[PDB]
Enzyme design. Structure first.
Site, PDB file in Angstrom:
ATOM      1  N   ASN A   1       0.799  -1.212   0.000  1.00  0.00           N
ATOM      2  CA  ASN A   1       0.000   0.000   0.000  1.00  0.00           C
ATOM      3  C   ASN A   1       0.838   1.270   0.000  1.00  0.00           C
ATOM      4  OD1 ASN A   1      -2.935  -1.207   0.633  1.00  0.00           O
ATOM      5  ND2 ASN A   1      -1.433  -2.258   1.931  1.00  0.00           N
ATOM      6  N   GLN A   2       2.157   1.158   0.128  1.00  0.00           N
ATOM      7  CA  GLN A   2       3.001   2.331   0.295  1.00  0.00           C
ATOM      8  C   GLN A   2       3.001   3.206  -0.956  1.00  0.00           C
ATOM      9  OE1 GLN A   2       6.875   1.185   1.687  1.00  0.00           O
ATOM     10  NE2 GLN A   2       6.099  -0.561   2.867  1.00  0.00           N
ATOM     11  N   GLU A   3       3.193   4.509  -0.740  1.00  0.00           N
ATOM     12  CA  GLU A   3       3.240   5.514  -1.805  1.00  0.00           C
ATOM     13  C   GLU A   3       1.946   5.516  -2.624  1.00  0.00           C
ATOM     14  OE1 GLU A   3       7.222   6.746  -3.602  1.00  0.00           O
ATOM     15  OE2 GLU A   3       7.488   4.582  -3.355  1.00  0.00           O
ATOM     16  N   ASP A   4       0.849   5.865  -1.948  1.00  0.00           N
ATOM     17  CA  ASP A   4      -0.461   6.019  -2.581  1.00  0.00           C
ATOM     18  C   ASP A   4      -0.899   4.756  -3.318  1.00  0.00           C
ATOM     19  OD1 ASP A   4      -0.589   8.727  -1.691  1.00  0.00           O
ATOM     20  OD2 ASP A   4       0.611   9.336  -3.425  1.00  0.00           O
ATOM     21  N   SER A   5      -0.477   3.593  -2.830  1.00  0.00           N
ATOM     22  CA  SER A   5      -0.875   2.326  -3.424  1.00  0.00           C
ATOM     23  C   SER A   5      -2.090   1.763  -2.698  1.00  0.00           C
ATOM     24  CB  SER A   5       0.274   1.318  -3.382  1.00  0.00           C
ATOM     25  OG  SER A   5       1.414   1.814  -4.062  1.00  0.00           O
TER      26      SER A   5
END
Ligand SMILES: [Zn+2]
Ligand SMILES: [Zn+2]
Ligand SMILES: [Zn+2]
Ligand SMILES: [Zn+2]
Ligand SMILES: [Zn+2]
Lengths: 194, 147, 110, 56, 279, 49, 184, 15, 43, 90, 112, 112, 65, 128
Positions: B1-5
């Site tokens: 989910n990192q960096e707007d995932s």
């Protein structure tokens, strides 16, 4: 939060800009339904089935799908059609075009100090042309009829000393445009200035 | 989910979540230059037609069109159009053997695929018979799709 | 993918920039180009002696470019010329020539 | 022998004479044996360093 | 002298080039041994993106107009120089003739196809010996009528005559010799919807006058006496079959037909009323 | 000019609110500038209040 | 001649001088009072009693929809139509021939002018980008697209205090056209 | 705190 | 080293009494005959 | 009947507008509500119909834009012109 | 704004937002916040547009400069810019912040 | 330098003609054939040159000779550089300015 | 549109609850939460389906084929 | 009212749907009463078509402005169609609102340049 309270109570919440609806009131209305007033909810892991140490902010939210999709973006080119003017890879995904190796990319390749990858990328990976120049005058007037191994250069009386060079087609367009502009881009394989 | 995932549930996708339809319209038109040369919508034969694309022509009818409902994929010709040529005008390659006409059809996009939704034929302003096509394709939300 | 040549292969070193002399232009060119028409009167081939005749380069792959032969993917091109009956000035030199007119006598040329 | 359709395959062969034979329509011929000095163009497998870039 | 490049497979050499052209890869390949025949394929669609031989031929020209930063004195000197060189070619008559023909066709509200057919006809005639004059009006009117007959359009002689005063007789002779020119360089049904549009009649009366026109063309007797009167008496019968009232004076003054002629044709037409019923 | 802008302005405002004058016309009375601008030209952007 | 340049100059002062108010003869006293008013505003601004006139005030700006644009366009096209009709009249009386109503009044000047101006981005380069294809991505894209106002190229990109209730303070594109495009 | 969308029954029961 | 220096100076320019920042950098690189704030520091 | 009037940006220079009607017109607290101004001004000539009308079409879809920063309202106002949906029924 | 009085120098009317994002903002504060947001976007856009031009001028300004096999920084024409790269001959990938113990400390600690 | 540059050579007397490999024409649909702008410029140079020779062969109006000389000078000048200040701009019959060689070597995303 | 089959989470069948839902709304004049409480939905994952549904097939059927 | 003249010569009424499908231009014909006189000098002795005008949708000249809901469903036009645009060659063209400055207002500005003029009093005068 207000979408969760609206999903539980069954009444669509008013989301106007300038009103008197506060967060504490929505926390109380959510507290009246049995859930946590702050939106948190105890979640369990999917792989181990073990309870998570930290409660997760969990609730419905309105989302939209944009026009940008991967199926209209991914494309790869390996030896395709060339333009008619510069004989370089075309521009556009519908025309099966290649990516642009701009000036900043070349400057980065110079920053890394790799000259062979720059030469290969600017010759074999794009366009590579072979031409013949004359010894006396460094212009591309050398008529090459090599089906019988024959060469000439018009206007300087040469049929022996003919040099072969590999330059990009765009550079040949530059030289021919300079010759069309009354400018002589004479090329010499030897150093006369020393 | 990192960096707007974002991680999306697969079972929700299989049940029809954020699934959308895309309708692409291909409009073709036959024209006449000086009345002597007339473009005609027809099914090109692989015997007398020069400059024919490598796509398949089995989905075309007798009028040179694809009836709606036929599943089409990329590199498929939707509208078959041929142009008359002169024998002593080009004579390139095998043009002195095909004699007849030259292919100039409008195929579907290379990366596209779907089911032809609707096809209609009409005369425009100056009376030229043009045809509009509309193909539908369901685009299931993929990993590379943006939200 | 081009055809092999027996000429010695060398790199390009010194590059000299100079003006084109009219005699050298006439010595490099092969055609005179007198007809302002593009193609031939029969609406096909080339005008032969015009703006784009087979004495220059050619495209369309199928054509052979008479004076190089070979093909368009090999043809460097060929040069024509235009012999004027009245001398004209070059734009990028209009100033320079003017400066020369202000640096030399207009009669004895000193 | 795998073909261009499969990922562990090839696309074009280049003989020592400097001539390229496409694997497509080459299966109609039958067999293609390689020799020392040829250049077979394969697909991008693993452990292949390639340049990665992002504009500007 | 030759100059014809023919691609063949030196390994196959069993038949003339029966090859396939791969545009995505930019090559052309023999469809037998699979050996490529050429690399780096050129395109014709890509060079066309930036951009008339049928009429202008191979002639080239460029306009000279005023510039962003320029003087009005230089614009006049360059245009006056072209005004002295305009006599070098006799093509000034084609642009002016196509300009006036353009004005007349744009005044008649005819489609662009009839305009291009008329321009093509005038280009076929142009300045021949058998024309021998006609003061530029009759070749224009006759060229418009020819372009009308070629495009399956119907325009009566009184319509172009109402546009241009060509004195009919000389118009007929110029149209005849012009038709001979066209034959040397090798249908009334369309009038019904036009007059039905002039009267504003429904579609059933239009197709009823179509069936009546064809049947009356099959019955013979009188044969025609020019198809215009057959059209107006056919529409007259098909409109006297229904109840929409126009009488004979209004239709005679609108379509420019004599009342005694539509009654003379209405007599024998009423005599042949038997076999003209469609339903 | 006018030597009584009070009663005149009140009259034009009362007749402007009754619907006689088109409400799109915007009238301003600058006191310090001692002016009374009247704008009835097209192109102005207004909002109801 | 001087006798014609004094009366010609007087006619300039009666007609070209201050086209507004009126252009008749005798209105010199009125224009004298207005001129003295402009001088009073200039010198009154020179005495530091009034600030420089602001141009970013939205009330001093006028928008143009289809009305004014088609007024200019139909005006010029109508002028060209009248001029062409008169040209046909002078040709008819000068060449001594018959007159025809089908050759004098043409319809492709108005049809080609309106169809060309509403077809292309230009409004005749003077003006460009006036006509744009309607964005049918969604309903709010069409609503926000039709109400979109453009400003041709103080800082006009920054949001001014006079845009309260008239221009949306949030709905604005990003990039080179930021703040030049506005939404009602 | 929610959008009152049942004003038809209130207006029908009040008028 | 020249390209490495030009990048080592151009990269901090993206994150951007006397005037500072991009205008000041423009005045320094262009070597302008006049500055936005010509000030001194008299010790 | 003289109950509502149009005002441009020129007349807006010479009027005093009130935001909420029942909050600034009459003459005189939970800590969750926002702090507002006072009603010391008496010569209120006009009153705002509703403040939420100052936003455009794209910003109107935003839920609670007061509690959100402005550039996010701008970015959402830009993404609202390209989302998938149903424009018409025909 | 036309919602306040004239000649008002109070901080609330001059742009102070005393409310928080948790309880919402008033219109006269949301308008000024929108002004600040648009100003931020415009400023970032101008800073990028000028940053690109500066980047091109720096790249094309310092290009044909290298270090030959003599530890001397000179361009392609032979013009010596620096006799030693960085005036020390050390790459920028092996330098670390160090402390000088010669100047640090007092005189009694130095002699001690 | 005698071997490379001469003031007599600065004045144009004979003009080189580049091959279609520099100005590739197109024949689309065999009835819509497009020629490059430099081709039209060469046609203008030929028409002005032949016109000037015809006017200088029989008779001498002294004024039409200067008009044709300035016409040829304008066609060659616009052939080398169409975007010349103080001079009229040559426009094609399609509605676009004539593309010259200098325009190919001047603007961004061109030959360099 | 036209009543989504199953649900977009739990998976319970809801398509057979629309006709009754409207029937409970137009006949008993109950609220939305009460009707959803009578249909048997106990989780808001389902509730967002019926509560946020925009039936557009009715506006699609009014066109002649 | 909006109309269409075909190639064969028939002219019938036009609807926006068929205008979009046939790539036509939603316009209406314009006529003018042209009066002619001949003087001989003050001795004194026609409905002509001038051109077509594109008609905006949902306007007093278009057919859809007076249509009802079911009538719009008969003409295959959604009732949610806001209109307010033109149709040229089957393309929905929109005229973006332009912005300009006003006139007939006395303006004053300063000149911070070394020009001898200190203040400028501009006023763009024009008729209505
Ligand atoms: Zn040589
Ligand atoms: Zn050649
Ligand atoms: Zn021979
Ligand atoms: Zn083969
Ligand atoms: Zn559920």
């Amino acid at each position: 939060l207000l979408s969760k309270v609206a999903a539980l109570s069954g009444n669509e919440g008013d989301a106007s800009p300038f009103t008197d609806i506060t967060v504490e009131g929505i926390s109380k209305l959510l507290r009246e339904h049995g859930y946590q007033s702050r939106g948190f909810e105890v979640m369990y892991n999917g792989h181990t089935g073990k309870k998570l140490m930290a409660q997760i902010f969990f609730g419905p939210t309105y989302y939209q799908r944009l026009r940008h999709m991967v199926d209209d973006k991914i494309h790869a080119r390996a030896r395709g059609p060339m333009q008619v003017l510069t004989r370089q890879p075309v521009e556009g995904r519908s025309r099966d075009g290649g990516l642009r190796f701009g000036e900043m990319e070349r400057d980065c390749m110079i920053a890394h100090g790799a000259a062979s990858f720059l030469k290969e990328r600017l010759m074999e990976a794009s366009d590579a042309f072979r031409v013949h120049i004359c010894g006396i005058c460094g212009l591309m007037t050398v008529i090459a009829k090599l089906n019988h191994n024959q060469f000439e250069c018009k206007g300087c009386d040469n049929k022996i000393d003919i040099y072969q060079i590999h330059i990009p087609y765009a550079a040949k367009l530059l030289f021919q445009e300079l010759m069309a502009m009354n400018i002589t881009p004479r090329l010499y394989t030897d150093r006369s200035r020393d | 989910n990192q960096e707007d995932s974002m991680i999306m549930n697969q079972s929700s996708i299989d049940r029809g979540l954020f699934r959308s339809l895309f309708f692409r319209s291909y409009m073709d038109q036959e024209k006449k230059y000086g009345m002597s040369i007339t473009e005609t919508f027809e099914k090109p034969q692989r015997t007398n037609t020069l400059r024919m694309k490598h796509g398949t022509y089995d989905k075309l009818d007798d009028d040179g069109l694809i009836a709606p409902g036929v599943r089409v994929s990329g590199e498929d010709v939707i509208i078959g159009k041929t142009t008359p040529i002169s024998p002593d005008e080009e004579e390139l390659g095998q043009r002195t053997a095909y004699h007849s006409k030259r292919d100039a059809s409008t195929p579907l996009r290379s990366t596209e695929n779907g089911i032809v939704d609707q096809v209609l034929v009409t005369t425009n302003q100056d009376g030229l018979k043009f045809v509009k096509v509309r193909v539908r394709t369901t685009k299931i939300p993929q990993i590379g799709d943006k939200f | 993918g081009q055809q092999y040549s027996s000429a010695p292969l060398r790199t390009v070193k010194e590059v000299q920039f100079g003006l084109f002399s009219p005699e050298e232009v006439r010595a490099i060119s092969v055609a005179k180009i007198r007809f302002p028409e593009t193609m031939d009167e029969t609406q096909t081939r080339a005008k032969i002696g015009g703006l784009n005749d087979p004495r220059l380069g050619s495209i369309d792959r199928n054509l052979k470019c008479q004076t190089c032969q070979e093909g368009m993917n090999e043809c460097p091109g060929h040069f024509g010329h235009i012999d004027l009956a009245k001398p004209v000035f070059h734009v990028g030199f209009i100033a320079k020539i003017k400066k020369v007119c202000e640096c030399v006598c207009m009669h004895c040329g000193k | 022998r795998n073909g261009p359709n499969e990922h562990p395959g090839a696309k074009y062969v280049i003989r020592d004479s400097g001539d390229r034979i496409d694997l497509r329509y080459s299966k109609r011929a039958g067999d293609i044996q390689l020799q020392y000095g040829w250049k077979v163009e394969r697909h991008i497998m693993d452990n292949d360093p390639v340049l990665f870039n992002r504009q500007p | 002298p030759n100059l014809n490049i023919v691609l063949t497979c030196p390994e196959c050499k069993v038949y003339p080039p029966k090859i396939v052209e791969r545009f995505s890869e930019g090559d052309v390949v023999c469809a037998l041994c699979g050996l490529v025949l050429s690399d780096k394929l050129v395109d014709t669609r890509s060079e066309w993106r930036t951009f008339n031989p049928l009429l202008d031929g191979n002639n080239l020209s460029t306009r000279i107009g005023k510039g962003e930063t320029t003087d009005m004195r230089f614009t006049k000197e360059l245009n006056k120089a072209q005004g002295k060189n305009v006599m070098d070619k006799k093509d000034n008559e084609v642009q002016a003739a196509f300009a006036k023909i353009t004005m007349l066709c744009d005044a008649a509200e005819l489609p662009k196809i009839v305009k291009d057919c008329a321009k093509e006809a005038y280009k076929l005639c142009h300045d021949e010996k058998t024309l021998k004059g006609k003061s530029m009006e009759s070749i224009m009117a006759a060229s418009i009528l020819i372009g009308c007959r070629r495009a399956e359009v119907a325009r009566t002689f009184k319509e172009i005559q109402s546009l241009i005063h060509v004195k009919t007789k000389e118009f007929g002779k110029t149209l005849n010799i012009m038709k001979n020119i066209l034959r040397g360089k090798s249908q009334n049904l369309t009038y019904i919807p036009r007059f039905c549009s002039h009267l504003g009649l429904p579609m059933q009366v239009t197709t009823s006058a179509e069936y009546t026109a064809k049947k009356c063309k099959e019955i013979k007797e009188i044969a025609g006496k020019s198809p215009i009167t057959i059209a107006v008496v056919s529409i007259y019968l098909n409109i006297l079959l229904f109840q929409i009232p126009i009488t004979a004076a209004k239709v005679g003054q609108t379509l420019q037909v004599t009342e005694g002629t539509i009654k003379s044709g209405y007599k024998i037409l009423y005599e042949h009323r038997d076999k003209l019923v469609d339903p | 000019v006018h030597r009584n802008p009070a009663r005149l302005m009140e009259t034009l405002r009362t007749l402007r609110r009754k619907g006689d004058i088109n409400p799109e016309v915007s009238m301003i009375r600058d006191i310090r500038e001692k002016e009374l601008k009247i704008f009835t030209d097209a192109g102005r952007v207004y909002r109801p209040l | 001649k001087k006798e014609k340049r004094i009366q010609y100059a007087k006619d300039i002062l009666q007609k070209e001088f201050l086209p507004h108010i009126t252009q008749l003869e005798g209105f010199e006293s009125r224009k004298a009072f207005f001129l003295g008013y402009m001088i009073n505003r200039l010198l009154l601004c020179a005495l530091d009693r009034k600030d420089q006139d602001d141009r970013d005030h939205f009330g001093k700006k006028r928008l143009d929809l289809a009305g004014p644009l088609l007024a200019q366009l139909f005006k010029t096209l109508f002028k060209k139509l009248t001029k062409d009709i008169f040209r046909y009249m002078q040709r008819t009386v000068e060449e001594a021939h018959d007159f025809n109503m089908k050759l004098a009044i043409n319809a492709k000047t108005i049809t080609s002018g309106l169809k060309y101006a509403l077809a292309t981005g230009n409004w005749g380069s003077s003006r460009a980008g006036v006509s744009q294809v309607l964005n049918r991505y969604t309903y709010s894209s069409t609503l926000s697209h039709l109400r979109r106002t453009n400003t041709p190229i103080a800082k006009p990109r920054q949001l001014h205090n006079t845009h309260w209730g008239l221009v949306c303070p949030a709905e604005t594109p990003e990039g080179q056209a930021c703040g030049l495009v506005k939404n009602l | 705190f929610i959008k009152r969308d049942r004003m038809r029954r209130n207006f029908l029961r009040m008028r | 080293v020249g390209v490495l220096a030009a990048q080592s100076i151009g990269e901090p320019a993206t994150q951007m009494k006397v005037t500072s920042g991009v205008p000041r950098l423009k005045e320094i690189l262009n070597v302008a005959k006049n500055m936005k704030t010509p000030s001194l520091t008299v010790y | 009947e003289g109950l509502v009037e149009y005002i441009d940006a020129e007349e807006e220079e010479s009027i005093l507008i009130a935001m909420q009607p029942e909050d600034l017109e009459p003459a005189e607290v939970d800590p969750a509500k926002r702090i507002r101004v006072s009603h010391h001004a008496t010569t209120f000539t006009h009153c705002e119909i509703h403040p939420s009308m100052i936003l455009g079409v794209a910003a109107s879809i935003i839920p609670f834009p007061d509690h959100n920063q402005s550039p996010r309202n701008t970015y959402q106002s830009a993404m609202g012109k390209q989302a998938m949906g149903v424009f018409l029924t025909n | 704004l036309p919602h306040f009085s004239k000649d008002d120098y109070s901080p609330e009317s001059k742009g102070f937002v005393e409310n928080s994002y948790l309880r919402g903002l008033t219109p006269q504060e949301f308008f000024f916040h929108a002004m600040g947001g648009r100003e931020g976007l415009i400023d970032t856009a101008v800073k990028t547009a000028e940053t690109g031009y500066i980047q091109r001028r720096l790249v094309k300004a310092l290009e044909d400069i290298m270090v030959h096999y003599d530890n001397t920084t000179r361009n392609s024409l032979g013009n010596v810019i620096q006799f030693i790269y960085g005036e020390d001959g050390m790459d920028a990938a092996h330098i670390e912040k160090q402390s000088l113990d010669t100047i640090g400390g007092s005189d009694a600690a130095f002699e001690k | 330098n005698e071997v490379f540059s001469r003031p007599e050579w600065m004045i144009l007397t004979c003009l080189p003609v580049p091959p279609p490999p520099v100005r590739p024409s197109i024949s689309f649909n065999e009835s819509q054939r497009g020629e490059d702008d430099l081709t039209f410029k060469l046609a203008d140079i030929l028409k002005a040159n032949i016109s000037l020779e015809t006017l200088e062969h029989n008779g001498a109006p002294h004024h039409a000779i200067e008009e044709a000389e300035s016409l040829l000078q304008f066609h060659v000048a616009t052939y080398m550089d169409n975007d010349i200040a103080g001079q009229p701009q040559a426009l094609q019959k399609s509605g676009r300015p004539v593309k010259s060689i200098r325009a190919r070597l001047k603007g961004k995303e061109g030959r360099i | 549109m036209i009543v989504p089959v199953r649900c977009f989470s739990c998976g319970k069948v809801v398509g057979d609850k629309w006709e009754s839902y409207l029937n409970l709304l137009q006949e008993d004049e109950l609220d939305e939460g009460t009707a959803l409480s009578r249909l048997g939905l106990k989780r808001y994952c389902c509730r967002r389906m019926i509560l946020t549904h925009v039936d557009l097939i009715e506006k699609f059927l009014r066109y002649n084929p | 009212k909006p109309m269409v003249n075909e190639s064969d010569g028939v002219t019938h009424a036009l609807y926006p749907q068929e205008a979009r499908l046939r790539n036509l231009t939603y316009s209406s014909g314009l006529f003018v009463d042209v009066k002619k006189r001949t003087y001989e000098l003050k001795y004194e002795l026609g409905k002509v078509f001038i051109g077509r005008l594109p008609i905006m949708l949902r306007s007093k000249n278009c057919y859809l402005s007076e249509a009802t809901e079911s009538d719009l469903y008969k003409l295959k036009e959604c009732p949610f169609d806001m209109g307010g645009y033109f149709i040229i060659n089957g393309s929905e063209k929109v005229l973006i609102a332009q912005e300009r400055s006003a006139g007939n207002i006395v303006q004053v500005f300063k000149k911070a340049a070394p020009s001898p003029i200190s203040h400028v009093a501009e006023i763009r005068s024009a008729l209505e």
